[PDB]
Design a binder for this molecule. Structure first.
Ligand SMILES: NC(=O)C1=CN([C@@H]2O[C@H](COP(=O)(O)OP(=O)(O)OC[C@H]3O[C@@H](n4cnc5c(N)ncnc54)[C@H](OP(=O)(O)O)[C@@H]3O)[C@@H](O)[C@H]2O)C=CC1
Ligand SMILES: NC(=O)C1=CN([C@@H]2O[C@H](COP(=O)(O)OP(=O)(O)OC[C@H]3O[C@@H](n4cnc5c(N)ncnc54)[C@H](OP(=O)(O)O)[C@@H]3O)[C@@H](O)[C@H]2O)C=CC1
Ligand SMILES: CCc1nc(N)nc(N)c1Cc1ccc(-c2cccc(C(=O)O)c2)cc1
Ligand SMILES: CCc1nc(N)nc(N)c1Cc1ccc(-c2cccc(C(=O)O)c2)cc1
Ligand SMILES: O=c1ccn([C@H]2C[C@H](O)[C@@H](COP(=O)(O)O)O2)c(=O)[nH]1
Ligand SMILES: O=c1ccn([C@H]2C[C@H](O)[C@@H](COP(=O)(O)O)O2)c(=O)[nH]1
Lengths: 525, 530
């Protein structure tokens, strides 16, 4: 039996990224504890709420078990419930005097120079175990600061680390100890949030080493595809996985465990399932996958191209955007029976349908001004003017034009929904390459949602991704296995040049991704 | 004090069907126990498998507390097995190869027979109280009363049953003995299961209840640090919220009514009624195990079938359905409605290029509801039927009603935007995306509509229907529907019915109304949403 287990000693810290000088990222990217005696940031209220809630929660119906445990360990039969909060000397000097001692906690100050003549002064870290051994308390929290964190980690006196990850960069003079991946492992991860203009997320480090019957009866009638889940050891060792990235990752997991084995065109073979939904809060984060690197320049130039209504593949290629290069080749168009189609003339695809649905497509150079239905203009007008309409849809799936398209759209339709100055978007995708396409598709429609929201004097809220035929290609399985056993970072944010007030005026400079913390790039094959 | 059935954990388990007699259905509908000494049905596997799993399942860990419980009650200090108790007739209805029931302590209630007339490892008792005695003298996990009708009768009468695990068999058979009429004041339902199909009958399993790492639970509390309505008091959902396990597929529907009521957004709309709305749901239905015709209100299927048939023919003529006395599209076709749609040159009940037209003639210039459109536009339905037969792994099997160019010419723009099909292992599944969803009125029918259509497509392509998947876009509840939905959300579903299609129909155009049969629909009372 261990001191940190008997006496229930945990740390709790909030670390931010630190100023420096291709950047590399690890857990130790978040290590900024303070600057000039004070916190590195000016105020992040959501972490304070977390901290204040965590260090004051107790469950009295569980103390009799802890009290009993602590007594037997010390060879005793004896010792309103409160936690204990242990702080360093400077850390105690840090707090204003109106917030000292901390409300409803047993304040304990570690110091060699104090003792005014209740708040307890302990001269050595060993006096804590002695002081806890004669106290009535639920759990004991090490509030730091920098030195106190170091010694308590050294002496293995830490059971769990409650680690706020503040996803922004500050000037600091003090830093958290480099957590030792042997000593501790991340067991849980929280939702991502935005507070005071920064994203943050909350993780837990763990020290390493009747209706019950009724439920069983209902399961009476309840791996499959040569996947050994011990390859997902880290993925299956997390108790709580609240991070929104797990929506994507769990879908990868489910297809791999349960997918139906199917041939397809390329001859690779997929595992597929049918019908999924993901939701992302665009007002808290920008869902750019952090468990591998993703680039957005080509994604944005594809969307700007869409907005112009161009079908000319050469515009993308002269910008070195090659998303569509393979769909415009002589061979690809000839395989689509498009023998009278100029190379890279992709025909009536997304941009055309969004701005001229119904118009007779002739070639990518033709002048289509005012031919067809300006779907994009229509939905923007409806958002500004008839916001509760249920008819605000952007449809790319023109049944008459499919065969003339270099290929039919994967992204069938966007539906929009407006409430309380908030705009939500649904995109229905008929075919989803979970390994290669879906990460990009999530970012495209999120950016597009922000773009639509800003030109309609609204705030972005939810991006909803509906997957139809959803498939992992077999040659991706090994790469996704590596990716399932990485743990997400807090998401980045997207910034739009505020001065763009109409959907056609966005340019590549008007887009800025802030604080993108990611794992290493993974070539999916 | 304490009650006997809790210390000694006495349960009843039974299986009941419908018996021979605009009918009324209550719980007493399912009451048929046996006929001519035997069970009324031939062999319903999944119920026996369920029966076996419940009566043989023990959990060793819980027995320490169990022995304490019965010790303190009596004022006292081979694997664990359950007790099963049967009446004499019940015991003689069992094939000898299966007697006594494996891994179980068999207790037989009898007056005319003695331990001498039995070869088998079995206890005989002549009166009920002696089971209580015997229970005190044995080591067992739980005690299950198997029947028959007399054994069920007197155990229910003497308040000796703590939980009734009750199989509702949703077919009719000839019977001569019956489970007692359960007393609602004495017992109430607490858990409904999934619906299953087994040996050509749908069934589920329901439970009655008698009426009157340890610090990582803290990690759960910490992560719920940043959480916390409309004018809905949850005491109006006493039955709904009291239910322990709600695994009946219909709770996928009912749970969305609840989510939109408790959480939705108050918005206006065209009608002036205003609604509560949410954005983006998905329901899945296993058409291989049941046909999801809602059971918490009565629904009719004749109109909607006629509609789907009208669709497949390509029709846009509102008179065709009105002469079948089907009024689904009548209001969207009045002179007044069409005028307010600024379709001044459209004849009354000519609905324009709507679903039927877009499915057979997408892109064709619409003229009037009487034109011959043959081989004009793109015949979507045929194209998907040939995709399913010949290119079953295509990810392009899509049916689309949302023809952006024709929207203004439609009486209404379509609510059901698209159907996507998926084929694996000879099983057809269907996604339909609905942009606007009226949970009180439309959605119950729209689930029925596209379930049937999946069946029809699956059949004409020689596949078995599997999964119908409903993606809801703008999902709303009208305020003038809330009070009826409150009643409905506190009704407990019945096992789903089934759909039979005539097997001789090999192409999608040949179906007629009489090729569709909906069987064993058990349902609550009709509900006017207004
Ligand atoms: N972001 C976060 O989660 C946290 C941020 N902070 C920030 O971190 C900084 C404070 O940490 P820091 O500045 O490193 O000062 P500390 O809070 O670490 O306290 C350091 C002092 O603790 C005493 N001490 C250390 N070890 C012992 C020991 N073994 N026995 C007795 N006394 C001991 C010494 O004072 P003596 O002279 O008495 O020996 C030492 O000077 C501030 O900038 C603050 O804002 C504070 C807490 C956590
Ligand atoms: N579908 C289902 O869930 C079930 C179906 N069944 C069906 O039910 C029918 C049998 O039930 P049933 O017909 O009611 O016959 P029972 O199983 O009720 O047997 C009745 C007999 O049990 C004995 N008995 C009953 N109560 C007592 C008592 N208090 N003290 C002593 N002996 C007692 C007597 O045997 P004696 O003549 O020796 O006095 C009596 O004649 C069959 O058709 C069977 O298949 C059976 C169980 C459940
Ligand atoms: C919030 C930064 C932080 N976050 C986490 N996770 N671990 C930490 N060690 C800290 C540092 C910290 C600084 C001040 C207080 C404080 C001050 C006044 C009053 C109170 C109070 O709770 O009343 C608290 C607390 C913590
Ligand atoms: C099956 C109808 C039924 N269903 C439920 N839910 N409760 C019940 N009381 C019964 C009645 C019953 C009839 C026969 C056996 C039996 C026969 C042979 C072997 C076995 C065995 O388990 O080996 C069981 C059991 C029960
Ligand atoms: O933006 C895109 C474009 C394509 N795909 C993938 C999904 C399928 O693997 C393939 C779509 O073509 P079909 O197999 O459905 O014809 O490309 C995506 O995931 N996202
Ligand atoms: O099959 C149908 C047809 C109509 N509606 C309802 C949903 C809306 O309340 C109304 C159409 O809404 P609009 O988007 O047209 O306003 O009809 C359905 O739920 N199902």
């Amino acid at each position: 039996e261990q001191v940190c287990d008997v006496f229930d000693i945990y740390a709790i810290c909030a670390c931010c990224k630190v100023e420096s000088k291709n950047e590399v990222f690890n857990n130790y990217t978040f290590r900024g504890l303070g600057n000039k005696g004070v916190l590195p940031w000016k105020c992040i209220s959501l972490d304070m709420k977390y901290f204040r809630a965590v260090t004051t929660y107790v469950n009295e119906s569980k103390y009799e078990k802890l009290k009993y445990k602590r007594c037997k360990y010390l060879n005793k039969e004896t010792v309103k419930l409160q936690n204990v909060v242990v702080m360093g000397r400077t850390n105690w000097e840090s707090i204003p005097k109106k917030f000292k001692p901390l409300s409803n906690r047993i304040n304990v100050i570690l110091s060699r120079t104090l003792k005014k003549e209740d708040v307890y002064i302990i001269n050595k870290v060993e006096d804590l175990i002695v002081l806890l051994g004669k106290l009535n308390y639920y759990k004991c929290f090490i509030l730091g600061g920098s030195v106190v964190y170091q010694e308590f980690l050294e002496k293995k006196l830490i059971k769990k680390i409650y680690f706020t990850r503040i996803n922004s960069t500050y000037e600091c003079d003090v830093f958290f100890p480099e957590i030792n991946e042997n000593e501790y492992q991340i067991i849980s991860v929280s939702d991502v949030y935005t507070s005071n203009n920064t994203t943050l997320d909350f993780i837990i480090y763990k020290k390493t080493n009747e209706e019950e019957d009724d439920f069983v009866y209902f399961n009476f009638n309840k791996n499959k595809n040569s996947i050994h889940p011990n390859d997902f050891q880290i993925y299956n060792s997390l108790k709580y996985k609240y991070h929104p990235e797990y929506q994507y990752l769990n879908i990868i997991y489910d297809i791999m465990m349960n997918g139906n084995k199917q041939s397809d065109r390329t001859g690779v073979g997929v595992l597929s399932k049918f019908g999924y939904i993901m939701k992302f809060d665009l007002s808290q984060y920008f869902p750019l996958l952090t468990t591998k690197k993703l680039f957005l320049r080509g994604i944005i130039e594809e969307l700007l191209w869409f907005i112009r209504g161009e079908t000319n593949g050469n515009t993308l290629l002269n910008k070195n955007v090659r998303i569509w290069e393979a769909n415009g080749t002589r061979e690809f168009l000839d395989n689509r029976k498009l023998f009278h189609r100029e190379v890279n003339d992709l025909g009536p695809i997304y941009g055309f349908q969004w701005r001229h649905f119904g118009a007779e497509y002739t070639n990518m150079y033709d002048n289509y001004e005012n031919k067809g239905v300006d779907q994009l203009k229509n939905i923007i007008n409806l958002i500004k003017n008839d916001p509760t309409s249920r008819r605000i849809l952007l449809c790319a799936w023109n049944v008459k034009d499919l065969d003339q398209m270099a290929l039919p759209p994967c992204h069938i339709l966007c539906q929009f929904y407006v409430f309380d100055g908030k705009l939500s978007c649904i995109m229905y995708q008929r075919s989803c390459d979970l390994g290669l396409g879906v990460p990009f598709n999530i970012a495209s429609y999120s950016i597009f949602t922000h773009m639509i929201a800003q030109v309609c004097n609204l705030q972005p809220a939810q991006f909803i991704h509906v997957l139809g035929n959803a498939h992992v290609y077999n040659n991706h399985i090994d790469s996704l296995k590596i990716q399932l056993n990485r743990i997400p970072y807090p998401f980045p944010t997207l910034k739009l040049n505020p001065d763009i007030k109409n959907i056609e005026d966005f340019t590549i400079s008007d887009f800025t991704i802030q604080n993108y913390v990611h794992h290493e790039k993974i070539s999916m094959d």
